[PDB]
Write a protein that binds this ligand. Sequence first.
Ligand SMILES: NC(=O)C1=CN([C@@H]2O[C@H](COP(=O)(O)OP(=O)(O)OC[C@H]3O[C@@H](n4cnc5c(N)ncnc54)[C@H](O)[C@@H]3O)[C@@H](O)[C@H]2O)C=CC1
Length: 419
Amino acid sequence: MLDDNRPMDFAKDKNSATLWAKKRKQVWLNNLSKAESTSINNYIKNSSEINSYSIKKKFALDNYEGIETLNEDLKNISTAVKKSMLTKPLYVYYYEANDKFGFNQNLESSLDSNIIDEEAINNFAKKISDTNFIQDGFKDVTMTEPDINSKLPILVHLKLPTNTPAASYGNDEENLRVLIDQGYSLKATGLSIVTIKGKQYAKVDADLIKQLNFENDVISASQWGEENYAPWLKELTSNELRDINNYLGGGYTAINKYLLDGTIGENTSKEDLEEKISNISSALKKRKIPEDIITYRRMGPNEFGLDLNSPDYDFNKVENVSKFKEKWLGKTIPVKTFISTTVLSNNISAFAKRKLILRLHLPNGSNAAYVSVAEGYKNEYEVLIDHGYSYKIDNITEYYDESSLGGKTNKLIIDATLI
Ligand SMILES: NC(=O)C1=CN([C@@H]2O[C@H](COP(=O)(O)OP(=O)(O)OC[C@H]3O[C@@H](n4cnc5c(N)ncnc54)[C@H](O)[C@@H]3O)[C@@H](O)[C@H]2O)C=CC1
């Protein structure tokens, strides 16, 4: 009933927005447990901290103890907002920075700050296409088109679909916000210029979408792998099973080295390497990825032309992160190797100090397989991708890995799309 008297979009009608928000906010708060009420209050005070913590937690090693009251806040805010699901779509609004679209060109004209640069917004149009922008943490937004200046260049007009957990909350009863649950992504649906208080903003129309992304959920991940690739495993030829297992047991070193630049160990031959590559690649064409999925990879510095001791690889310094972002944002990188990925975001002990974390949109139809169906229960939840694809670099987002075992260093989350 709480959506019976409202449009999908309040537009500029703040009075109708407030009437709607006040009623559902009251119902919602009374349905919260004490723990949920506390965590929502914690979000009002410490939202930046909670959202930043959620990133550290999802990319940490398994033995990460973390901060127990923030662990509680992550759980309780999520169960809280799930008590307030929309019954019809709701359009929402927020100003946004360049960085959240992986865009590093100024959209302001050089000659007039009120005016958007035509060439920049043309490049922006290409950059936001063909991309699902993962939204980390919880996202809070406003109900009406802002009537105030922003230092930010972009206005997002975001369509939340029916059944989105989206709770009315906040301390200003006349400007109540909307708190969106974790786990969503943004998909642009249109681009235009909007003028607000005499100044032009790039207006991104977008849908809120939910991509399959297991993060730390080992139970769901292994179930998905079993369901979708147990038959794949049984139908492998003997050689395909053999050379898949060779690769996964340590043959990757020689196989991917050869695919990268033709290196041949002394005791092997080109023809034996070609054979293994042919059987693995044939196996990976047998069952295309059945739905869009996010997978992960702890990447070594050579995958971006860097060496372990390169000064440019020290992301603890600001200028190196800026250099890396300038070099790779928006680029397409061909990948000659097979790509070993995992459906879990957890850091991996053998790779704990690698500083580059691939977060890969792996499309429906990709030649890849959940290969861990073959191993025993000590497995790494792996999706192996065929050689010869490319990465489209969508975003680069730093976070600080404080852990001794992680290397006490900034690391870069590289959001990419497989092409
Ligand atoms: N790295 C990861 O996140 C995951 C790896 N595994 C498994 O661990 C084992 C070893 O994994 P990796 O060390 O990652 O094998 P790998 O052959 O991909 O990489 C080994 C070394 O070669 C570099 N390298 C790989 N591809 C490159 C490319 N196109 N260009 C330049 N340098 C490249 C890497 O940075 C690394 O230093 C495999 O069985 C693999 O399936 C399992 C879960 C995910």
